[PDB]
Amino acid sequence: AMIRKYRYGAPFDTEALTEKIETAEEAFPYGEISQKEGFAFTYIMDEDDIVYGLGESNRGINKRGYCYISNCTDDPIHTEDKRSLYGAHNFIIVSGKTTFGLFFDYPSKLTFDIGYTRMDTLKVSCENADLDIYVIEGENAYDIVKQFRRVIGRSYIPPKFAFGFGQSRWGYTTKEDFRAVAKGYRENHIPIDMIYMDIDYMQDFKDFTVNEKNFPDFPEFVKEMKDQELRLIPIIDAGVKVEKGYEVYEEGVKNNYFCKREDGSDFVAAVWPGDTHFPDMLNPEARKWFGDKYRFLIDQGIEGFWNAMNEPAIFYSSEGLAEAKEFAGEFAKDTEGKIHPWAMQAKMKDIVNSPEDYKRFYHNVNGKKIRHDKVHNLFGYNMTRAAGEAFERIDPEKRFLMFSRSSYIGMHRYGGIWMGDNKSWWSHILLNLKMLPSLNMCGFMYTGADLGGFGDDTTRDLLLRFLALGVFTPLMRDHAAEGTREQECYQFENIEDFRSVINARYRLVPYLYSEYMKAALNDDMYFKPLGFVYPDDKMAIRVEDQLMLGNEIMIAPVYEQNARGRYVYLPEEMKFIKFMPDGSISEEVLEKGVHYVDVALNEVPLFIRSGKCIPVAEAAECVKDIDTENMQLIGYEGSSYTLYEDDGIHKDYDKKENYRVLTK
Amino acid sequence: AMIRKYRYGAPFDTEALTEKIETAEEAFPYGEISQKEGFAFTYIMDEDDIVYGLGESNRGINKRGYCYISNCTDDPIHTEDKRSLYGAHNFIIVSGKTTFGLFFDYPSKLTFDIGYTRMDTLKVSCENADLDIYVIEGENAYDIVKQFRRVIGRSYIPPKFAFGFGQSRWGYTTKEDFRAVAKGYRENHIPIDMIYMDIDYMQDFKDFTVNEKNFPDFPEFVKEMKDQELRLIPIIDAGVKVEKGYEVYEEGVKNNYFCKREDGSDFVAAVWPGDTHFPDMLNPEARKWFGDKYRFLIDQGIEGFWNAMNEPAIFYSSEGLAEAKEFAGEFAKDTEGKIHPWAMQAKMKDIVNSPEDYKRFYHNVNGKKIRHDKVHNLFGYNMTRAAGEAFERIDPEKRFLMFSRSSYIGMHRYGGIWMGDNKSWWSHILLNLKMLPSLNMCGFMYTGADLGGFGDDTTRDLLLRFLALGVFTPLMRDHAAEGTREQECYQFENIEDFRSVINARYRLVPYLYSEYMKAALNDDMYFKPLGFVYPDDKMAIRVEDQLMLGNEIMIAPVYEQNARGRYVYLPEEMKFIKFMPDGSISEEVLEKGVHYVDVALNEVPLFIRSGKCIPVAEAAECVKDIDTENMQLIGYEGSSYTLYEDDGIHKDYDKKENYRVLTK
Ligand SMILES: OC[C@H]1O[C@H](OC[C@H]2O[C@@H](O)[C@H](O)[C@@H](O)[C@@H]2O)[C@H](O)[C@@H](O)[C@@H]1O
Ligand SMILES: OC[C@H]1O[C@@H](O)[C@H](O)[C@@H](O)[C@@H]1O
The DSSP code sequence of B196-240 is EE-GGGSSTT-TT---TTT-TTHHHHHHHHHTTT-EEEEEEESPE
Q: CA-CA distance, A644 to A662, in Å (whole number)? A: 11
Residue B511 has φ and ψ, to the nearest 5°, of -70, -45
| DSSP 8-state secondary structure symbol assigned to residue B267 | P
> In chain A, which residues have their Cβ closer than 8 Å to the Cβ of B567?
567, 594, 596
Minimum-distance CB partner of A81 among B120, B337, B424: B424
Apex B459 CA angle, B455 and B465, nearest 5: 95
**CB A218 within 8 Å of CB A224:** no
The three-class DSSP label of residue B513 is helix
> Is B66 an interface residue toward A (CB < 8 Å)?
yes
Q: CA-CA distance, A381 to A310, in Å (whole number)? A: 8
DSSP E strands, A361-501: 362-365, 368-371, 401-404, 407-408, 416-418, 447-448, 477-478
Instruction: Count other Cβ atoms within 10 Å, centred on residue B414.
Output: 24
Residue A426 has φ and ψ, to the nearest 5°, of -60, -30
Per domain, the residue ranges of chain B are: 1-154, 155-537, 538-664
State the DSSP string of B334-365.
--SS-S-HHHHHHHHHHTTT-TTGGGS-EEEE
3-state helix, strand, coil in chain A (%, to 5): 30, 25, 45
**CB B458 within 8 Å of CB B489:** no
Q: CA-CA distance, A15 to B625, in Å (whole number)? A: 67
The residue type of B66 is Y
> In chain B, which residues have their Cβ closer than 8 Å to the Cβ of A425?
79-81
**CB B363 within 8 Å of CB B278:** no
**CB A421 within 8 Å of CB A455:** yes
The residue type of A216 is P
Apex B251 CA angle, B249 and B257, nearest 5: 90
**CB A199 within 8 Å of CB A309:** no
Q: CA-CA distance, A479 to A473, in Å (whole number)? A: 15
Q: CA-CA distance, A29 to A7, in Å (whole number)? A: 13
A266 backbone φψ class: left, alpha, beta (φ>0; ψ -120 to 50)? beta
Say if residue B312 is preceded by a cis peptide, omega within 30 of 0.
yes
State the DSSP string of A284-318.
HHHHHHHHHTTHHHHTTT--EEEEESTTT--SEEH
**CB B453 within 8 Å of CB B462:** yes
> In chain B, which residues have their Cβ closer than 8 Å to the Cβ of A60?
561-562
The three-class DSSP label of residue A656 is helix
To which H or E segment does residue A225 belong? helix A218-226
The experimental method is X-ray
**CB B145 within 8 Å of CB B441:** yes
State the DSSP string of A491-525.
GSS-THHHHHHHHHHHHHHHHHHHHHHHHHHTT--
| DSSP 8-state secondary structure symbol assigned to residue A260 | B
Resolution rounded to one decimal, in angstroms? 1.9
Q: CA-CA distance, B33 to B126, in Å (whole number)? A: 12
Q: CA-CA distance, A384 to A403, in Å (whole number)? A: 8
Q: CA-CA distance, A295 to A391, in Å (whole number)? A: 8
Q: Find residues 253-312 of chain B whose CB sits inside 8 Å of chain A.
A: 274
The nearest CA of chain A is from the CA of B369 a distance in Å of: 31
Q: CA-CA distance, A458 to B56, in Å (whole number)? A: 22
Q: CA-CA distance, B9 to B374, in Å (whole number)? A: 14
The nearest CA of chain A is from the CA of B484 a distance in Å of: 12
> Is A590 an interface residue toward B (CB < 8 Å)?
no
**β-pair partners for B613:** B635
The residue type of A120 is D
Q: CA-CA distance, A286 to A392, in Å (whole number)? A: 17
Classify burial at A306, counting beta carbons within 10 Å of its beta carbon; exposed 0-12, middle 13-18, buried 19 or more: buried
Q: CA-CA distance, B176 to A285, in Å (whole number)? A: 64
Note the ligand closest to the C-alpha atom of B239: 2
The residue type of A576 is F
Q: In what order do the strands lie in the sheet with A131-136?
A: A3-8, A131-136, A100-105, A91-95, A50-53
Q: CA-CA distance, A187 to A580, in Å (whole number)? A: 22
Residue of A nearest to B596 (CA): A594
A410 backbone φψ class: left, alpha, beta (φ>0; ψ -120 to 50)? left
| Distances from the Cα of A441 to the Cα of A475, A529, B75, B145, angstroms | 17, 10, 39, 52
**Is the fold of B155-537 the same as that of B538-664?**
no
Q: Find residues 454-473 of chain A whose CB sits inside 8 Å of chain B.
A: 456-457, 459-462
Task: Count CA atoms within 13 Å of residue B662 on its CB side.
Answer: 25
Pocket of ligand 2 (CB under 6 A): B 74, 76, 308, 313, 421, 481
How far does the centroid of ligand 1 lie from the alpha carbon of residue B337, in Å?
21
Say if residue A312 is preceded by a cis peptide, omega within 30 of 0.
yes
Q: CA-CA distance, A550 to A9, in Å (whole number)? A: 41
Instruction: Count other Cβ atoms within 10 Å, centred on residue A538.
Output: 11
Q: CA-CA distance, A578 to A575, in Å (whole number)? A: 10
The three-class DSSP label of residue A563 is coil
Q: CA-CA distance, B393 to B298, in Å (whole number)? A: 13
**CB A594 within 8 Å of CB A621:** no
The nearest CA of chain B is from the CA of A68 a distance in Å of: 13
**β-pair partners for B527:** B549
How far does the centroid of ligand 1 lie from the alpha carbon of residue A421, in Å?
7
Nearest partner of A445 among A477, A484, A413, judged by Cα: A413
What is the atom index within ligand 1 of the atom nearest the CA of A168? 23
Q: Which positions ≥6 away from B214 have C-beta within 8 Å?
A: B173, B174, B175, B201
Nearest partner of B281 among B203, B389, B156, judged by Cα: B389
> Is A425 an interface residue toward B (CB < 8 Å)?
yes
Dihedral over alpha carbons A148, A153, A156, A160 (to 10 degrees): 90
Instruction: Count other Cβ atoms within 10 Å, centred on residue B571.
Output: 21
| Distances from the Cα of A255 to the Cα of A285, A286, A475, B172, angstroms | 10, 9, 37, 60
Task: Count CA atoms within 13 Å of residue A317 on its CB side.
Answer: 21
Q: Which CATH code, of 3.40.630.10, 3.40.50.10860, 3.40.50.300, 3.20.20.80, is assigned to A155-537?
A: 3.20.20.80
B618 backbone φψ class: left, alpha, beta (φ>0; ψ -120 to 50)? beta
- Which residue stretches of A310-374 are H helix? 318-333, 341-350, 355-358
Q: CA-CA distance, B464 to B146, in Å (whole number)? A: 34
Q: CA-CA distance, A427 to B274, in Å (whole number)? A: 38
To which H or E segment does residue A7 belong? strand A3-8
Q: CA-CA distance, B403 to B380, in Å (whole number)? A: 11
CA–centroid distance for B414 within its chain: 12
Q: CA-CA distance, B549 to B541, in Å (whole number)? A: 15
Q: Which positions ≥6 away from B578 have C-beta within 8 Å?
A: B585, B586, B599, B603, B604, B605, B606
To which H or E segment does residue B147 belong? helix B141-152
The three-class DSSP label of residue B176 is helix
Residue of A nearest to B116 (CA): A459
DSSP E strands, A405-468: 407-408, 416-418, 447-448
**β-pair partners for B636:** none
The three-class DSSP label of residue B432 is helix
> Is B537 an interface residue toward A (CB < 8 Å)?
no
Task: Count CA atoms within 13 Å of residue A549 on its CB side.
Answer: 26
Within chain B, what is the greatest distance between any pair of CA atoms?
A: 84
Q: CA-CA distance, B608 to A641, in Å (whole number)? A: 50
Residue A245 has φ and ψ, to the nearest 5°, of 95, -25
| Distances from the Cα of A320 to the Cα of A123, A315, A323, A351, A357, angstroms | 34, 10, 5, 5, 8
Q: CA-CA distance, A109 to A126, in Å (whole number)? A: 6
**β-pair partners for B588:** B576
The three-class DSSP label of residue A446 is coil
**β-pair partners for A67:** A113
> Is B47 an interface residue toward A (CB < 8 Å)?
no
**β-pair partners for B404:** B417
The nearest CA of chain B is from the CA of A80 a distance in Å of: 6
Q: CA-CA distance, A302 to A291, in Å (whole number)? A: 15
Q: CA-CA distance, A73 to A84, in Å (whole number)? A: 6
The three-class DSSP label of residue B487 is coil
Residue of B nearest to A545 (CA): B560
> In chain B, which residues have their Cβ closer than 8 Å to the Cβ of A328?
328-329, 331-332, 344
Nearest partner of A81 among B424, B289, B466, B342, judged by Cα: B424
What is the atom index within ligand 1 of the atom nearest the CA of A313? 17
**β-pair partners for B260:** B266, B362
CA–centroid distance for A261 within its chain: 31
Say which CATH architecture domain A1-154 belongs to: Sandwich (2.60)
The residue type of A206 is K
Residue A364 has φ and ψ, to the nearest 5°, of -100, 100
To which H or E segment does residue B436 belong? helix B427-441
Q: CA-CA distance, A604 to A578, in Å (whole number)? A: 5
| Range A181-217 burial, b when 16+ CB lie within 10 A, else e | bbebbbeeebbbbbbbbbbbbbbebbbbbbbeebbee
**CB B63 within 8 Å of CB B57:** yes
**CB A439 within 8 Å of CB A56:** yes
| Breaks in chain A after (C-N > 2.5 angstroms) | none
Apex B485 CA angle, B480 and B487, nearest 5: 55
Nearest partner of A424 among A449, A404, A406, judged by Cα: A449
What is the atom index within ligand 1 of the atom nearest the CA of A352? 15
Closest Cα to atom 18, ligand 1: which residue? A308
What's the CATH code, domain B538-664? 2.60.40.4040
Which of A48, A57, A69, A81 should be substituted to probe chain B, the one whose Cβ sees the most B Cβ atoms within 10 Å? A81
Minimum-distance CB partner of B341 among A348, A457, A561: A348
Q: CA-CA distance, B44 to A244, in Å (whole number)? A: 60
Q: Which positions ≥6 away from A68 have C-beta within 8 Å?
A: A54, A57, A58, A59, A83, A84, A111, A112, A114
CA–centroid distance for A185 within its chain: 25
**CB B430 within 8 Å of CB B465:** no
| Breaks in chain B after (C-N > 2.5 angstroms) | none
Q: CA-CA distance, A282 to A375, in Å (whole number)? A: 9
State the DSSP string of B31-80.
SEEE-TTSEEEEEE--TT-EEEE-SS-SS-SS-TTEEEEE---------T
To which H or E segment does residue A576 belong? strand A574-579
Residue A293 has φ and ψ, to the nearest 5°, of -65, -20
Dihedral sign for Cα A405, A409, A415, A416, please. Answer: positive
| Distances from the Cα of B569 to the Cα of B145, B471, B597, B607, angstroms | 24, 21, 10, 11
The residue type of B664 is K
| Range A55-80 burial, b when 16+ CB lie within 10 A, else e | bbbbbbbbbbbbbbbbbbbbbeebbb
